[model samples]
Target chain A: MLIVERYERVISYLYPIAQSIPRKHGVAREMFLKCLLGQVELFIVAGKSNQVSKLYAADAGLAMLRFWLRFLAGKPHAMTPHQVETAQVLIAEVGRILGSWIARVNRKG
Target chain B: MLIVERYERVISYLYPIAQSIPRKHGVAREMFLKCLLGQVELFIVAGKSNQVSKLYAADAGLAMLRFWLRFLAGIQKPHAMTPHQVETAQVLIAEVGRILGSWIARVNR
Candidate 1:
């Protein structure tokens, strides 16, 4: 199946997480999430790559996401420290794996 | 297309939801979201699936997402019961579809 076809399933997985977030922070969350989604579409459009494109794109998205998360955490009324920490830990782990995968893919090519 | 490419768009859909969760719940929320995202990438690099791998990856992701949602809803100070109930109903419907899909895919293979 085309990868994009899986979008609905993936989105389904994410929907509640998105919904659980507070409406007040919706704008920032939307911006951050949309940017991430855009990056994925860009990668799909670009297609199979041994190139650094995917790596670069992922890095950029991750960075943007981090920025948003940090901003949210720092806000007077933003996410709690526990929430921020958990998010940070998750991203760090993901980033580490993704970074390595990208490097391996690039090296393979 | 390689599946990871779709990450951005997927995250985009989740942005509003992520932002909507309260700051108090942000860490646990972030942890939950990031973990699910990581699992997706992990599946991609470890591919091509013989069907089971793909199915399992998806199942795990969905399960993890649900667990976090439930955790968010249970606490008195956490997610509102009204929204929580709605989410539960939607997932119950979605899970039925997923369960059937899994059975079919398994039997076919």
Candidate 2:
């Protein structure tokens, strides 16, 4: 649940910027949105199942999300450096939280 | 390292097939090879670091590998791979996936 809260923080920060990507760049915009939204489904599944595989799956989605974010950052005028930095910071925190949960599960096992 | 061992088996099986993807299909060919090789790096990192994020990254790359595999299959004419060939590749992927699933199941407990 802590991970979910942090994930929501990431969503709040990135969603606005992602939505603002130029209308002309439909592919990137759509991909960015899909990657962000996909994680919501993944994370919720992980939370409910309390399964490490579920978390691992979510983590994979997060990695793909990072990939799309990098693509956006690479394109000229797609997003501001400050915005990218902010989104990355938020995403990194979510990754850390997710890792901590995995460690906890490992310890319990 | 069961998963690692199985992944290597996948590479051994698919490397030649992926390498032979028609020259004109360079993007798919290159992407397929990189996804396979990249997992080698990511899996090794995950093993050494015992970091879930590392494993998650590897998982994400694996997903990409599957995508490229499907692409090759769909464009059977261009890739020059038969459905059976693609099925064999998929079979290997499924094996690795099962091993990975067992891994997560064990960790989740």
Candidate 3:
């Protein structure tokens, strides 16, 4: 899929995830939501080398999300199956997109 | 202007500048275009801390762009009035946006 579509898919999955996060963790929840928005912005700007940078930024954000998810998963009461599944899907997509964009940059260079 | 609109104006100005650059500087031309794209992506992603990051990123990108533009302007024969004017405008917008976004982040914090 195109970079924009890939990013949108992640955002679509992220919204519910952000909303579901406990309000007590307001700062973390806000960070997650902001990251989601940033990913979308990155996609909108994708073009040649910018695409590569976006991929890198997105990968970083994805890593942060996964780190948070792993923590959440270990909790006595963790994320729902749907939340887990969505997060997994987003992680996979972001990974694929990063790889593809990097490859493109290499080829062009 | 909103961040998105501000970004679009820069991109719009950037297209012609990219096209006008001497083909001998292919690598620089490509880099400039890529930076332009990356800036747009950053704007799209703007929200909370991501917005702060995007602003920082955009400022860096703008600095790089200006560095190149100055180099171009100093050449034996330099950029057209339109190009110079446009670049100046973009630089101003990016600077303003960076300051504004940072202020917003501090307020939210």
- Each model's interface RMSD (Å)? 9.6, 8.7, 15.3
On a 0 to 1 TM-score scale, where does candidate 1 land against the true structure? 0.39
Best by lDDT: 2
Per-candidate RMSD, Å: 12.6, 10.8, 17.9
Q: Candidate 1 residues B56-98, lDDT tens each?
A: 4444454445444454455345562245553744455354335
Error of 3 at A103 (Å): 1.5
DockQ for the candidate 2 complex?
0.02
For each candidate, the alpha-carbon lDDT, in order, equals: 0.52, 0.72, 0.58
- By lDDT rank, best first, the candidates go 2, 3, 1
lDDT per residue as tens, model 1, A1-109: 1333333333333434444567777676666556534434433422333357655775777687667667766745656667667666666655665667667777787
Per-prediction count of colliding residue pairs? 20, 0, 7
**Model 1 lDDT, residue B27, Cα:** 51
Compared with the true structure, the alpha-carbon lDDT of candidate 1 equals: 0.52
Candidate 2 lDDT, B1-109, residue by residue in tens: 7788889988998889888888654444665787787788867787777556555666666666765565566553344466788788889989888876676566546
* Per-residue accuracy of model 3 over A49-74 as CA lDDT, tens digit each: 34466666656766776776666665
Query: Which runs in model 2 stand beyond 4 Å of their true positions?
Result: A1-109
**Candidate ranking (TM-score, best to worst):** 2, 3, 1
Candidate 2 chain B: minimum summed lDDT over ten consecutive residues — where?
B71-80
